[PDB]
Design a protein around this motif. Structure first.
Motif, PDB file in Angstrom:
ATOM      1  N   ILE A  69     -21.753 -19.604 -43.847  1.00 44.14           N
ATOM      2  CA  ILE A  69     -20.905 -20.304 -44.803  1.00 44.14           C
ATOM      3  C   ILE A  69     -21.103 -21.812 -44.703  1.00 44.14           C
ATOM      4  N   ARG A 117     -23.738 -24.428 -54.897  1.00 42.66           N
ATOM      5  CA  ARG A 117     -24.720 -23.491 -54.378  1.00 42.66           C
ATOM      6  C   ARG A 117     -25.603 -22.965 -55.506  1.00 42.66           C
ATOM      7  N   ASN A 142     -23.155 -17.562 -47.993  1.00 41.66           N
ATOM      8  CA  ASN A 142     -21.885 -17.576 -48.715  1.00 41.66           C
ATOM      9  C   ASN A 142     -21.592 -16.239 -49.383  1.00 41.66           C
ATOM     10  N   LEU A 177     -15.719 -23.664 -51.075  1.00 46.87           N
ATOM     11  CA  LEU A 177     -16.820 -22.900 -50.502  1.00 46.87           C
ATOM     12  C   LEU A 177     -17.691 -22.228 -51.554  1.00 46.87           C
TER      13      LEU A 177
END
Ligand SMILES: CCCCCCCCCCCCCCCCCC(=O)OC[C@H](COP(=O)([O-])OCC(O)COP(=O)([O-])OC[C@@H](COC(=O)CCCCCCCCCCCCCCCCC)OC(=O)CCCCCCCCCCCCCCCCC)OC(=O)CCCCCCCCCCCCCCCCC
Ligand SMILES: CCCCCCCCCCCCCCCCCC(=O)OC[C@H](COP(=O)([O-])OCC[N+](C)(C)C)OC(=O)CCCCCCCCCCCCCCCCC
Ligand SMILES: CCCCCCCCCCCCCCCCCC(=O)OC[C@H](COP(=O)([O-])OCC[N+](C)(C)C)OC(=O)CCCCCCCCCCCCCCCCC
Ligand SMILES: Nc1nc2c(ncn2[C@H]2C[C@H](O)[C@@H](COP(=O)(O)OP(=O)(O)OP(=O)(O)O)O2)c(=O)[nH]1
Lengths: 95, 62, 368, 67, 100, 165, 341
Positions: free
Chosen positions: C1, C11, C42, C67
């Motif tokens: 992560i 991402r 992730n 995230l």
């Protein structure tokens, strides 16, 4: 007669291996080893049959391939219970 | 006359049904005809193997 | 992560996202479209658990936006009582018999001792179990990780919490334990679990600070029910989930900071558990072959009716979970003659649907 | 490229595949050379093989010099 | 030989596996049975073609020849046990080593 | 005579195979039965190819799996009994002297060897183990051995799936 | 059962091995095909999620290799007695061949492995077991001409397969016991025809596909689980449960047709007492079919109220509703059929 003097012994040892295959005084590994004992007796009787004909003995490695795949199949069935039933399942007298 | 025609048709159907039952019984008794009650045993594979064994006699050499 | 702040941007996916809500995934789809080609750091399932007054929707939203994951909200019983066409089935309550009427968490907040409450918790489990698979279909088919406010692994805590206060009988515990033992072994355990720790008095303080009209003037949230659930979390559910999932205790008695827990997540090395094959941690996500990965994707993207038909346990010995046959008949005659649910969704011409004469598209994983 | 990677990591398998391709090529060459002539009629039969002149196989015998 | 139920492409390999047709002492007997099984079929060939069945079974099964050999050897031993034949004339003149 | 000796040895190893219960000991009895079965099938045949094939496939190839599984199955050693050894020796000497007092011409097998055939037999003089193995590699029986090699690969695919690795 | 393409590979190789069995012109190539079918049916009937499936595969292996070696030994014995594959006068080696085939098929003197293995399987490997795995032994049984072994097997199959399914409340063992009774109708048809057997086997197979799809899509393994099964309209649950009345042999539905053709051909073959012994022992089969039909023939039940949505597959239930229509309205197609004659 012909059956009493010739090929009587593979029948008797085949029935002895069949009775060792199914007896309740044995275990699963003993069943598999007696199974390959009757595989050996089946090869003996099949070769006695196939040698009355002259040049058809090539079938002996066909039955060998099938029964050896059966034996490896039975061993891989039996050891697949190691991670599930534990290492003590080889001593099981009943199914 | 409609009932007479239907009775004649059903009676003739009864005779043909009895006759085909008799024909099928005599066919299954003897296994004679090649339509029903006949197991076709062929020696095509035996003739193929004999032709192959005759062909490999020419191949035998050095 | 890896977070967005250290990465310097959003991402990138390793492959194209599969339309898992439109196209099915059978073995003939699994021959061409592989599923381990879109997995990265992730691709974890994070469950943010905590007491009932802790801020978890806001924290899960900022964790999903930080995230780069998808936020799955907490389940509520509006998903059954409002259909796909938007009609509310709480307006059918005078037509329904009183043993088969609507029972939302508002009716639990005023009337916790009702006989429908033992049904209600089971219904809540049937919305958590239906959500997590819908979470898992986002993990295996698109590669993006998911974050969940509530998980079906933690739903038994509320079951024993209503049992200890006396709202459930022993038979309700038995049928919920039978449903859990029937169903909980079929879904993968999460990678990471965050417990937002709160004392019992601060939960009451946040409850009176929220000023929701059914949380206030309710006798359910006493000093024993909240203490029972916060004790029961940390000594049953956390102790069960720590064998597989990583467990993060955060003192949430203050307002709580987000960057420190992202820092605490980022120092966790996720590759050290894959060295041992027989390790207890991350055992459910240890697929050594691509065929096992495709089998795992097939199990949740194609075999979700099997896992939803696993709720078919017969237990007729309880009187408060058995719907009587005349009440069931009039319940069918009221519920299935509604404007929303006269037919299957997408095929109801009474609520504005056209082109039904040449429409033969059923849909994927649709409740009938 | 792809052949450079296979020659770097696994050179014995590349050399064996070259040998196997060469063996397949000369196997097809040997089959075509065997069936280009009368390879089914071998010059040196085993056993004692005699044909009378009325047989069709007696007209197909080889009168070549011994090599 | 058994008549298969279905005649698919998958009987083409199994059919030639065992057969006296490859060189054998009397595969020419078996052919004289097998074409007979093309004539009458399998079930009428069990009745109308019983003379050609017994010759092939006699040849490759070797039943009556071995039974006659065991009748000639047990009668000699019975004559030995009954005292009619004894001494160095118990066994006859042996054949030459390349006679057969 | 030696065929009757192999008969007696196979009978003795079979009755001790029925008697014993330790799994590696049954595996040892199988590996010493396979040698006698190989030799006894070598007595009927023209040449010892198929005895060698049965030897490599069964004993050295397949039964080592059985010996490994039965070796790791049993922690304990063999409990050797001199009573069973004495009974096996007594029945073995009884069956060898029974073969001594029996006519070996009537008890010999009717299956022909390579030298029991006729002298005018053309096919026996050509090449040892040639015409019997010929049908493995000729039309139309080559599809069976192609299917056998495919069957062995498919067997390996089955075994990897059922053991779960 | 389609979690992997390797299972599709095992399915096509077990189809190939069964077709090698039923087309072999010798008694040894049939054994070769039997071993191919066994090799490809060991990994199916085995799975990691179910614990009982591995020991059920062990039971299947020991039962089949016991039956296949006796089948090989008796076939080699027949070939040692008479060197052709057929036999002029029937003797005891054909009895050993037929008993080894009856251990493979699951006739009632040798059927005790069948529901005991069926107690721990899924509903698709059961669909392969009672339909396709009955192809390879039963098509070899038609080559033998002994009558009393078939008589004993038919009589024992229709009494033991009907009585023994009464105590079972598990759906898999009840369907195994019902397939044992429907096995005996197939062997009773095998003594009189090789085509009426195909009629009974094809429509029994059809009824097996349409009835085991009801328990596979909705995951039903118990008699009490049928009462808790939620269908949105109770008329649809009443209509879907007519396949039990169809397979039990009731005249308006399909499934009366093959049993009726067996009755028509047996009476024409002058066999009346065995037909009466089967049909007095097929009412018990309809009795444990109607015990399943307690859960749909009444129109209202005391249902559990936590589940309110019916969850189902799309392709499998789309294939299911075609075959449910022809299971109960399929007697209109008797005018189009010509394969009875
Ligand atoms: C004239 C007549 C005179 C009197 C004759 C009397 C005969 C009957 C009494 C003797 C007898 O049979 O006693 C039974 C007595 C009991 O034996 P047991 O308990 O039935 O089984 C033997 C043990 O398992 C053996 O257990 P162990 O592992 O301790 O054995 C040690 C091993 C030690 O072996 C050696 O030292 C042999 C060295 C290698 C030899 C070559 C390889 C084999 O001894 C043997 O193998 C003995 C042979 O056996 C012996 O005394 C064996 C020798 C005879
Ligand atoms: C009189 C002689 C005196 C001198 C010799 C005295 C000693 C006698 C001989 C002893 C030999 C050594 C014995 C022990 C060997 C120990 C080392 C060992 O096993 O190494 C294994 C090594 C292992 O391979 P490796 O080195 O690739 O693997 C290690 C590297 N990793 C793991 C990272 C991949 O080598 C081989 O196995 C090589 C293959 C066999 C040899 C090559 C055959 C190739 C085919 C023929 C040529 C093909 C055509 C080429 C030309 C055309 C090309 C297009
Ligand atoms: C000839 C030698 C026979 C040895 C023998 O049978 O020993 C008995 C033992 C029996 O082992 P066991 O532990 O299975 O004994 C059970 C059988 N009773 C109790 C009747 C003796 O077998 C062996 O030790 C095998 C040795 C290798 C044989 C090859
Ligand atoms: N009976 C019962 N009540 C439940 C269950 N799950 C939640 N509740 C009730 C208890 C509380 O009134 C409330 C819990 O609040 P949530 O967990 O949704 O958190 P809340 O929305 O207050 O804050 P957050 O969104 O986390 O910031 O819902 C359950 O499984 N059973």
């Amino acid at each position: 007669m012909i059956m009493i003097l010739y090929w009587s012994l593979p029948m008797i040892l085949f029935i002895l291996g069949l009775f060792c295959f199914v007896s309740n005084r044995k275990h699963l590994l003993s069943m598999l080893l007696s199974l390959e004992f009757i595989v050996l007796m089946l090869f003996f009787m099949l070769f006695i049959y196939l040698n009355m004909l002259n040049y058809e003995s090539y079938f002996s490695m066909m039955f060998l391939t099938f029964s050896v795949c059966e034996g490896a199949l039975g061993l891989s069935i039996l050891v697949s219970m190691i991670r599930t039933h534990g290492n003590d399942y080889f001593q099981s007298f009943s199914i | 006359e409609k009932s007479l025609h239907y009775l004649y048709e059903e009676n003739e159907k009864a005779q043909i049904r009895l006759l085909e039952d008799e024909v099928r019984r005599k066919m299954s008794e003897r296994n004679d005809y090649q339509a029903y009650y006949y197991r076709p045993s062929v020696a095509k594979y035996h003739r193929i193997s004999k032709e192959a064994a005759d062909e490999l006699e020419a191949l035998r050499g050095d | 992560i890896s977070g967005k702040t250290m990465r310097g941007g959003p991402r990138v996916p390793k492959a194209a996202p599969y339309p898992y809500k439109t196209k099915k995934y059978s073995v003939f789809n699994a021959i061409f479209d592989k599923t381990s080609k879109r997995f990265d750091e992730n691709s974890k399932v994070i469950c943010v658990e905590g007491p009932i007054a802790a801020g978890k929707s806001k924290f899960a939203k900022e964790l999903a936006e930080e995230l780069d994951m998808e936020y799955y909200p907490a389940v509520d019983l509006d998903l059954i009582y409002i259909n796909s066409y938007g009609y509310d089935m709480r307006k059918l309550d005078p037509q329904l018999p009183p043993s088969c009427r609507s029972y939302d968490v508002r009716n639990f907040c005023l009337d916790p001792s009702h006989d429908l409450a033992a049904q209600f918790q089971i219904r809540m489990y049937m919305l958590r179990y239906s959500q997590y698979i819908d979470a898992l279909q986002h993990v295996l088919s698109t590669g993006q990780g998911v974050v969940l406010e509530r998980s079906p692994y933690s739903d038994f805590v509320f079951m024993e919490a209503m049992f200890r206060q006396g709202y459930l009988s022993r038979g309700a515990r038995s049928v919920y334990n039978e449903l859990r033992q029937n169903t909980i072994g079929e879904l993968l355990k999460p990678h990471l679990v965050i417990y937002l720790d709160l004392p019992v008095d601060a939960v009451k303080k946040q409850i009176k600070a929220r000023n929701v009209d059914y949380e206030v003037q309710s006798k359910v949230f006493s000093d024993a029910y909240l203490s029972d659930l916060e004790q029961l979390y940390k000594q049953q559910y956390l102790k069960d989930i720590s064998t597989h999932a990583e467990l993060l205790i955060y003192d949430w008695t203050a307002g709580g900071e987000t960057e420190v827990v992202v820092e605490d997540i980022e120092r966790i090395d996720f590759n050290q558990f894959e060295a041992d094959i027989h390790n207890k941690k991350m055992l459910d996500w240890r697929f050594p072959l691509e065929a096992e990965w495709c089998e795992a994707r097939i199990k949740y993207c194609h075999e979700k009716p099997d896992l939803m038909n696993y709720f078919n346990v017969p237990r007729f010995d309880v009187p408060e979970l058995v719907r009587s046959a005349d009440d069931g008949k009039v319940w069918r005659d009221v519920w299935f003659n509604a404007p929303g649910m006269k037919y299957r969704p997408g095929y109801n011409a009474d609520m504005g649907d056209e082109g039904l004469l040449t429409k033969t598209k059923i849909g994927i994983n649709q409740g009938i | 490229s792809l052949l450079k990677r296979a020659w770097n990591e696994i050179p014995d398998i590349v050399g064996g595949s070259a040998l196997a391709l060469a063996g397949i090529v000369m196997a097809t060459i040997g089959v075509a050379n065997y069936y280009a002539k009368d390879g089914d009629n071998r010059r040196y039969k085993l056993g004692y093989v005699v044909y009378r002149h009325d047989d069709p196989r007696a007209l197909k015998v080889r009168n070549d010099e011994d090599d | 030989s058994l008549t298969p139920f279905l005649r698919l492409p998958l009987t083409d390999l199994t059919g030639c596996l065992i057969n006296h047709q490859t060189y054998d002492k009397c595969g020419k007997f078996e052919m004289k049975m097998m074409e007979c099984f093309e004539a009458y079929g399998l079930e009428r060939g069990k009745r109308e073609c019983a003379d050609l069945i017994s010759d092939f079974q006699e040849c490759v099964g070797m039943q009556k020849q071995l039974m006659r050999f065991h009748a000639m050897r047990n009668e000699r031993y019975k004559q030995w046990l009954k005292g009619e034949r004894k001494g160095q004339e118990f066994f006859a003149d042996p054949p030459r080593v390349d006679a057969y | 005579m030696i065929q009757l000796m192999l008969y007696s040895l196979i009978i003795t190893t079979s009755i001790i195979f029925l008697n014993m219960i330790h799994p590696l000991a049954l595996g040892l009895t199988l590996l010493i039965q396979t040698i006698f079965v190989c030799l006894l099938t070598g007595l009927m045949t023209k040449s010892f190819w198929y005895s060698y094939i049965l030897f490599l496939i069964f004993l050295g190839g397949m039964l080592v799996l059985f010996i490994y599984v039965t070796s790791l199955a049993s922690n304990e050693m063999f409990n050797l009994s001199m009573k069973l050894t004495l009974f096996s020796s007594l029945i073995l000497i009884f069956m060898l002297i029974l073969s001594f007092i029996m006519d070996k011409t009537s008890s010999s097998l009717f299956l022909m060897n390579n030298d029991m055939q006729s002298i005018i037999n053309m096919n026996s003089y050509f090449m040892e183990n040639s015409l019997s193995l010929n049908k493995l590699y000729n039309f139309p029986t080559n599809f069976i051995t192609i299917l056998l090699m495919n069957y062995l690969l498919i067997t390996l695919i089955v075994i990897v799936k059922i053991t779960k690795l | 059962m389609f979690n992997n393409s390797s299972k599709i590979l095992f399915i096509t190789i077990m189809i190939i091995g069964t077709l090698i069995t039923v087309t072999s012109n010798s008694w040894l190539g049939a054994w070769m095909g039997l071993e191919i079918n066994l090799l490809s049916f060991i990994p199916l009937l085995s799975d990691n999620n179910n614990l009982m499936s591995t020991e059920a595969s062990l039971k299947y292996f020991l039962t089949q290799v016991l039956a296949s070696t006796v089948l090989l030994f008796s076939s080699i014995l027949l070939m040692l007695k008479n060197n052709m594959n057929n036999e002029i006068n029937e003797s005891f080696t054909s009895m050993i061949i037929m008993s080894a085939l009856l251990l493979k098929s699951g006739a009632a003197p040798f059927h005790f492995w069948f529901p005991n293995m069926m107690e721990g399987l899924t509903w698709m490997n059961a669909l392969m077991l009672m339909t396709w795995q009955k192809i390879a032994p039963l098509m070899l049984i038609s080559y033998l001409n002994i009558k009393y072994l078939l008589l004993i097997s038919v009589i024992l199959s229709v009494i033991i397969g009907a009585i023994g399914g009464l105590n079972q409340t598990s759906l898999r063992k009840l369907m195994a016991f019902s397939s044992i009774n429907h096995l005996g109708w197939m062997l009773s048809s095998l003594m009189i025809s090789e085509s009426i057997w195909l009629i009974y086997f094809f429509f029994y197979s059809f009824l097996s596909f349409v009835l085991t799809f009801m328990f596979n899509i909705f995951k039903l393994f118990h008699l009490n689980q049928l009462f808790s099964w939620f269908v949105n309209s109770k008329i649809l649950k009443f209509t879907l449960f007519m396949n039990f009345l169809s397979l039990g042999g009731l005249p308006p539905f399909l499934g009366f047709l093959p049993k009726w053709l067996v009755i028509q051909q047996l009476t024409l073959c002058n066999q009346y007492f065995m037909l009466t012994l089967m049909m007095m022992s097929t009412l018990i089969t309809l009795f444990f079919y109607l015990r399943i039909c307690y859960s749909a023939f009444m129109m209202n039940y005391f249902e559990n109220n936590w589940i309110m949505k019916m969850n189902m597959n799309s392709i499998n239930y789309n294939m299911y509703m075609i075959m449910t229509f022809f299971s109960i309205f399929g007697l209109f197609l008797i005018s189009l059929f010509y394969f009875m004659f």
